[PDB]
Amino acid sequence: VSQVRQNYHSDCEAAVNRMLNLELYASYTYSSMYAFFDRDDVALHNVAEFFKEHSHEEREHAEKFMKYQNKRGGRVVLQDIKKPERDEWGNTLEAMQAALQLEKTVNQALLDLHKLATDKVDPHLCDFLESEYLEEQVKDIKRIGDFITNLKRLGLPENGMGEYLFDKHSV
Amino acid sequence: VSQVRQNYHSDCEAAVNRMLNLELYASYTYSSMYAFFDRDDVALHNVAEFFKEHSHEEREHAEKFMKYQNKRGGRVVLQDIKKPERDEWGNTLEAMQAALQLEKTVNQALLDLHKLATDKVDPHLCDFLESEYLEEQVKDIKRIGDFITNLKRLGLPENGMGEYLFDKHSVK
Amino acid sequence: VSQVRQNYHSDCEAAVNRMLNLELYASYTYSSMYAFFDRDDVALHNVAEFFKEHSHEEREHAEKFMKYQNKRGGRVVLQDIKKPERDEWGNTLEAMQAALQLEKTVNQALLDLHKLATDKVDPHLCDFLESEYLEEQVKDIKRIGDFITNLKRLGLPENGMGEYLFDKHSV
Amino acid sequence: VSQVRQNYHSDCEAAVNRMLNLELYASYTYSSMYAFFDRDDVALHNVAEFFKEHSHEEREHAEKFMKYQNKRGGRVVLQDIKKPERDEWGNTLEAMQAALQLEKTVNQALLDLHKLATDKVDPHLCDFLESEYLEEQVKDIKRIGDFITNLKRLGLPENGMGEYLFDKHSV
Ligand SMILES: [Fe+3]
Ligand SMILES: [Fe+3]
Ligand SMILES: [Fe+3]
Ligand SMILES: [Fe+3]
Ligand SMILES: [Fe+3]
Ligand SMILES: [Fe+3]
Ligand SMILES: [Fe+3]
Ligand SMILES: [Fe+3]
Ligand SMILES: [Fe+3]
Ligand SMILES: [Fe+3]
């Protein structure tokens, strides 16, 4: 038992480890979309850089969980980082739609981690989650949603021109 | 009642009053430590300053509670501030050790207030505790722990050369 | 075939996909060391941050591989990133010894991917490896070598003081 | 013999001369394309400026060869620079397609020379090609590809509005 640990459930410790992995998984996925839109036969660089940046942001969320772990006195246990569901992502719309699902998923795991944290009466974990993750999620979901709606408006999947515009004007 | 009072429970006002006293108590104890490391026969000046600093911080944590008490409509009520447990702190290791406990004690008094505040449906007192105290506590507790580990890596309490390096390298 | 592809053998393309996965694995391992020297019962922060950055550096060698793949016309295919081979790292000397082996493992894979290149007669791939990876590797290796030498000099694994000084002066 | 020549095979010297002439030829063509898009019945001025640009880059590449020739103590021998295959380039998609082949033809020419150099053990001519030409080539090839894909996304050659948009955003 760490000299530092106080009011930290084992269940919450394992959960954070589990969450740390979800975040790395999501980052890995955003990285795949980046490399896809960077293919010469896709070539949408603004769409690519938008995923490369989301990938990095996601990596941070993970580093941030590692720190939270040690500060509470739990121990980081790492798992395999599984490869993303697909090797290719079709077009901007499809990618955005997978993104939207990815974020909703990640957000549900955080929502569960908070509910778990409430059960175990750990207000420090709740505030961490609230302050660093919860609101950050709804902003990403809103942002992404706004895009999908614009992509559809712009003629996707069929409208080549609409995809080209979205790349130039929306990111 | 206070014209300003709303959703503030007697039991919570009283706990805030106790919490303030605990802060002051901690303040006085770190104060005691500074004095000790300042003595010619202890002479660890950076460690001493560390405890002087933490002391001021703790005193700030107690004022923040006064401001709050008044802010919610409740009434500050002061109690004696009891002298620290010891007049002498042995060395850096013992002192860091006593401070961990002190910090973990204060932490718990605060988690107990958050509990009390949750049960009394007082989201304001909960967000106050959360954003002003709770995170500063786990940070203090990790910083002190980090220290103990190094203080043990360096050879304490036996090794003096190690305690000397700690004053020069782990603090200011 | 990609309109872009000229003189990229598929052997090299698949070997590039593997180097990629390797860099990520290396990066994952370093992330683990970072989180280790950060636990309250270890607490060598300067050592931790040296692994955190090495982790980032690796991460970027990986991205640099994805970008290459697209530039040549090859297709990026991702695999699982495997959890590091340990969960705790003992101490600064053990960790540094682990890193030496890991780095020499990557160096070798690079060297192979270069012989593979030389043999398929791909001068661009060769010059790429020579310019962005080969010398970075022997530099990073010479660096860790030095560290080990000093760690051993400082009394590791037993000399608590030696280890604590290394944290303050060598990193 | 030049007082300066050392390890410079006559076959390499000759191939440098031909590589020089290829460069000039590539220049002249891009120049033609410039002239085309600057016509009042074509009128894609950014597109034209892109090709004027490339035209300069290539004359630069020819010059670097003249100087390399004299650096090695070989003799620069000039040839006719023959006119481009067309006097008119149809449209942006065709111009880009024509340049994609043009670059690949130049690229292969270089790779062939790099091999001639390997067979004659001229590490210098070899490094020279690696550092000044090779990576530059696959960059230009990737870039023109990206364009061709985007150009198709925009419905070329049929869609005029797309061609307009391409000239206003990609170049
Ligand atoms: Fe996230
Ligand atoms: Fe995200
Ligand atoms: Fe709450
Ligand atoms: Fe306090
Ligand atoms: Fe404190
Ligand atoms: Fe590497
Ligand atoms: Fe490295
Ligand atoms: Fe050229
Ligand atoms: Fe070479
Ligand atoms: Fe060129």
Q: For chain A, which chains pass the contact test of at least 3 CB pairs under 8 Å?
A: B, C, D
- Provide, as residue numbers in chain D, all residues whose Cβ is less than 8 Å from the Cβ of C71: 138-139, 142
Instruction: Decide if C123 contacts D108 (C-beta within 8 A).
Output: no
Count CB atoms within 10 A of the CB of residue B140: 20
Task: State in words which class domain B1-172 has.
Answer: mainly alpha
DSSP, res C139: H
Peptide bond into B84 cis (omega under 30): no
Q: Is the dihedral of CA D136, D142, D146, D147 positive or negative?
A: positive
Residue A161 to residue D169, Cβ atoms within 8 A: no
Which technique was used to obtain these atomic coordinates? X-ray
CB–CB of D79/D24 below 8 Å? Answer: no
Considering only CB atoms, which chain A residues are within 8 Å of C21? none
Residue D137 labeled ligand binder: yes
Using alpha carbons, select from C77, C25, C16 the residue that is nearest to residue A81.
C25
Residue B157 exposed, middle or buried by CB count within 10 Å (0-12, 13-18, 19+): middle
Crossing angle of the two packed helices B160-169 and C160-169, in degrees rounded to 10: 20
* Residue C36 burial by Cβ neighbours in a 10 Å radius (0-12, 13-18, 19+): buried
Give the type of residue at A70: N
- C164 reaches B (C-beta below 8 A): yes
Rounded CA gap, A53 and C149, in Å? 39
Could you tell me which of A36, A79, A80 has the C-alpha nearest to residue A55?
A36
Question: And the tokens for D148?
Answer: 């061709």
Half-sphere CA count of C151, side-chain side, radius 13 A = 19
CB proximity under 8 Å: D 100-159 to A: 142, 145-147, 149-150, 152-155, 159
Q: Is the backbone peptide bond immediately before B157 cis, with ω within 30 degrees of 0? A: yes
- Smallest CA–CA distance from D147 into chain A, residue: A43
Distances (CA, A) of B91 to A15, B98, B104, B170: 39, 11, 20, 15
- Distances in Å between the Cα of B76 and the Cα atoms of A50, B13, B17, D35 are 53, 8, 6, 86
Cβ-defined contact of D148 to C7 (cutoff 8 Å)? no
Q: What does residue C81 show for φ and ψ, rounded to 5 degrees?
A: -90, 125
CB atoms within 10 A of CB B1: 7
Residue ranges of domains in chain D:
1-171
A105 has which bridge partners? Answer: none
Which of C12, C71, C129 is best to mutate for the D interface (most D CBs within 10 A)? C71
In CATH, what class is D1-171?
A: mainly alpha
User: Could you give the 3-state DSSP secondary structure of residue A86?
Assistant: coil
- Name the 3-class secondary structure at C81: strand
CA distances to B61, B147, D35, D106 from B24, rounded to whole Å, are 8, 24, 84, 80
Give the DSSP letter of residue B154: T
Q: What does the alpha-carbon distance between residue D154 and residue D146 come to, in Å, rounded to a whole number? A: 12
Nearest CA among A25, A130, A4 for reference residue A78: A25
Q: What are all long-range contacts of A126-133, with beta carbons under 8 Å and residues at least 24 apart?
A: A126/B130, A127/B130, A127/B131, A127/B134, A127/B135, A128/A68, A128/B135, A132/A61, A132/A64, A133/A61
Whether residue D130 and residue C121 make contact (CB cut-off 8 A), yes or no, is no
Q: Which of D149, D154, D161 is facing A41, going by the closest CB pair?
A: D149
What is the token pair recorded at D131? 């550092």
8 Å CB contact between D71 and D26: no
∠ CA A95-A100-A102 to the nearest 5 degrees? Answer: 90
Of B1, B16, B15, B123, the C-alpha closest to B73 is B1
- Reading the block at residue A40, the tokens are 């010469």
C113 CA to centre of ligand 7 in angstroms: 17
State how far the Cα of C141 lies from the Cα of C51, in Å rounded to an integer. Answer: 14
Closest to D115 in 3D by CA, of B50, C121, B61, B105: C121
Upper half-sphere CA count for residue A14 (Cβ side, 13 Å): 4
User: Is D163 marked as a binding-site residue?
Assistant: no
| Other beta carbons within 10 Å of C77 | 18
> A66-80: buried (b, 16+ CB within 10 Å) or exposed (e) per residue?
bebbbbbbbebbbee
Chain A residue whose CA is closest to B136:
A124
- DSSP class per residue in A2-56: -TT--S--HHHHHHHHHHHHHHHHHHHHHHHHHHHHTSTTT--HHHHHHHHHHHH
